[PDB]
């Protein structure tokens, strides 16, 4: 029933559209995506799944009730200037761009019509397999039903919860960048399996399965990750020997460093944008 | 499903792995909790308390578990295996499939002990992990000298009900131990640290734990469902000049990859040690 | 309301551990100082002068300690134990319970020496630590081949009066040595360093020592009285974006956890070495 | 005992970990009845809130009700929230109130500046305590404000002494105390988790390793508190020549163990000064 549009036809638009249609919450023919470079492979992949495509951002606005801004953050101000006069009372504008504040979006759109309905979200690529992690904050003029609607839609493709907007840059450093930390870890674990004699294909499968199962255990347990760790570690055994070498390298500190670096870079980029 | 029609399972050991497998098997609906028996020298453990509430029959006598079981899981520390085999070895019958879950303990060592009692013991060596409790385990197995072809198939059916399962040659199992056997502990360490990072940057602990676990689960599922190399999936996350590539740099500067290689290696080498002694 | 009216305790050795146990036992009220005897080859020790103030009986001669005592603590350095056993082996009687506190020294080695003189020596191996002096020790023990069930129950009753005490299998004792035997030294090092940190940030040394020690005492008590994982208690300290989580990050960046694992391992390995050199 | 018969009403603005720990400690000490405590929170869905409710503490979403109920009012919210709180309930602070700020870094001066716009002589005490008040072994320091009476400081010390060590300090020491004993229990929990991992590596069951390590730390801390000897002298007494302990102390030294704990106290103290200097600019 709902009309959804994507300004930007890149990886996030594809991941969301694929997740939404796989969830059955949207029909692909009721989704429109716009792109300045109608030659990207994501544009061909979106066409393959049945999404309507166009090179005119104005056409996406006119087709859509819910409008996802899935362009790079530095492109958001240009998009808002281009379509701001075409936003109407019915529109919910959902910015997925890292760093970009609700304030900055509302300021641009309010020059055209007052009370723009804005939602800011931070999600990640695993929405493509319906296991995303999404947070959102509601704007000044977002109606109560707007937030509930967005949580219903985004919950179909993974975890979703409302947050205060000032948490979103930190979320970006944790679950926004998080999949890349995991892909790095899985490549390295597979290298370790190969060093010890496993075929690469088996090593990749087992490492990914180990990470998936541990993550699901933690999500389904009431227990602290340290207690679950204690349960793996038999006295004098193989696991506790491996945990020691992780500790000796400061493994934990590197992951803290990563979340911090991603969060700080997100803040830094938006400070550059506000100036 | 005919494999599991009237099959009885027994656990020698009532620790973390016996609970995890029993919880996995029952949640999968392949075996009924009362068709499972576990034996422990210390009934005062927390795992023994949960198994009891599950409906799993407990006993202090390993011989009772052997007589009641068709498939017999050995879920004890590797150094107890030869003392267990001496105890119940005269009770192992031709009908038994003995599944050793101990790290390092070789099929050959088990067959040598049991062949002194009856000449063709059916032995399978297995390496699994605790996420079988949520039916997302990672399991490999190797079949012994006298294991029948249906024994391997039954093993694969049973262990596939609680996660990934594949047959391997036995000489890969120590390496699998270092990767997916110990793997969940690396992940739990990583998730604790990632949550600490979220807390440092201002998130509540409960939200940080949930987001980090969901990110890891989703990334792992993406890789399992993709034909692309993990490096290509990584490249797709990292926009030029962006937050993710800045974070990946600090991981690289601390040798993040080498620590995980070190871990797989250290767990595998310890597993070889536990066998050689 | 515990008191061992028929027990005479002897210490061979009058060093730190003998004083600590005698002080703990007497402060607990379970033993009168005059029913305790200690022997030492160096009668001019600081710990010897302190035992005398408590009223403990002192003698230079280990044979007198043996003759006076029913429960005999061997509180000497590990390499001295075999010389001690040769010296008093012929004086061990049926009534004696020999409690070895020496790190590394196996029940088997003690029983082999003593059995040359009289079969069936009653031997218990103990690993305890200096905080027994304030009745907050951590003690494990393992019972020997010829120790009766009541011997272990008695020693657990005695050692529980000065702290935590539990029976373990003997093959755990070298690892316990690396954890709770050496543990108090790890804590004293940490408390000195924490106080230096407080002083760097402007606190008087005396206050910094007091606050750091109270922080460690309270946290340890919290964990002992809680069913929660130390990571959960840690999480409760750490407010988002706050002071504590910033400090935890710098501990992690230096591999703080790995150093403590290194320490337990090094103490345990050295304990195993010392014994393997003895045999 | 003398405090119990004072029949004091206590309020907490904030119903998080510190409010729970102090409420738990005060009620376990017998100085306060649980139902004489009221706590408020903008989020009533917290686990600490449910624990307070089970204890019998009164809970309300309205800070004004906590203020009106209280004689001693603890501010147990995050530092950046304190000025919003003071704006909200400043007009409700009465001459009879003692206002006790627990927030890291927040200065007496900043609190008095807000509250003085309403009544002229707000009685303010700044304290830094820690979570082991829950087992009555906290470490607490406090500094008295401009208008706190001598009886106010003495009442504060009596109250906080019921749940651990408590002493008055000059306010300029509190940021350093925060880095030492405020954050200190988290350093100890990290150390205990690691020591237990070490015990497990060397073959102990986890439960025993946790118990032994915590007992070792408790006993050592108590030894130091009851000794007039330097911690280096107590360390020397543990370490027999050539023995296991001195080998372990060497590997601690080779990793810079001492420097890491100095780094920790410094980092916590510096962050505490930043939390204030940030809010000061704002
Ligand atoms: C089986 C293995 C992975 C076990 O967890 C160990 O730590 O030895
Ligand atoms: C979503 C965000 C974290 C993206 O990965 C980036 O680096 O811009
Ligand atoms: C140390 C205290 C003030 C609190 O635990 C924090 O981390 O801010
Ligand atoms: C028994 C051991 C812990 C003692 O401290 C030593 O170093 O010999």
Swiss-Prot record, chain B:
Activity regulation: Subject to competitive inhibition by the reaction product proline. Subject to competitive inhibition by stearoyl coenzyme A.
One Gene Ontology term, aspect cellular component: mitochondrion
Positions of NADP(+) binding: 12-17, 40, 62, 75-78, 101-103
UniProt GO BP: cellular response to oxidative stress; L-proline biosynthetic process; negative regulation of oxidative stress-induced neuron intrinsic apoptotic signaling pathway; proline biosynthetic process; regulation of mitochondrial membrane potential
Binding-site residues for L-proline, renumbered to this chain: 170, 243-244
Residue numbers carrying N-acetylserine: 8
Effect of residue 227 to A: Reduced enzyme activity
Pathway: Amino-acid biosynthesis; L-proline biosynthesis; L-proline from L-glutamate 5-semialdehyde: step 1/1
Catalysed transformations (reactions): L-proline + NADP(+) = (S)-1-pyrroline-5-carboxylate + NADPH + 2 H(+); L-proline + NAD(+) = (S)-1-pyrroline-5-carboxylate + NADH + 2 H(+)
GO molecular function: identical protein binding; pyrroline-5-carboxylate reductase activity
Subcellular location: Mitochondrion
Swiss-Prot/TrEMBL keywords: Acetylation, Amino-acid biosynthesis, Disease variant, Mitochondrion, NADP, Oxidoreductase, Phosphoprotein, Proline biosynthesis, Stress response
UniProt key word Electron transport: no
Outcome following mutation: residue 272 to Q: In ARCL2B; may cause skipping of exon 6
E.C. number(s) listed in UniProt: 1.5.1.2
Record has Phosphoprotein as a keyword: yes
Top-level taxon in the UniProt lineage: Eukaryota
Binding sites annotated in the UniProt record for NADPH: 14, 16-17, 40, 42, 62, 76-77, 103, 236
Disease in which the protein is involved: Cutis laxa, autosomal recessive, 2B: A disorder characterized by an excessive congenital skin wrinkling, a large fontanelle with delayed closure, a typical facial appearance with downslanting palpebral fissures, a general connective tissue weakness, and varying degrees of growth and developmental delay and neurological abnormalities. Patients do not manifest metabolic abnormalities. Cutis laxa, autosomal recessive, 3B: A disorder characterized by an aged appearance with distinctive facial features, sparse hair, ophthalmologic abnormalities, intrauterine growth retardation, and cutis laxa.
Function: Oxidoreductase that catalyzes the last step in proline biosynthesis, which corresponds to the reduction of pyrroline-5-carboxylate to L-proline using NAD(P)H. At physiologic concentrations, has higher specific activity in the presence of NADH. Involved in the cellular response to oxidative stress.
Family: Belongs to the pyrroline-5-carboxylate reductase family.
Assembly and interaction partners: Homodecamer; composed of 5 homodimers. Interacts with LTO1.
This protein's name: Pyrroline-5-carboxylate reductase 1, mitochondrial
Portion of the full sequence shown: 1 to 271 of 319
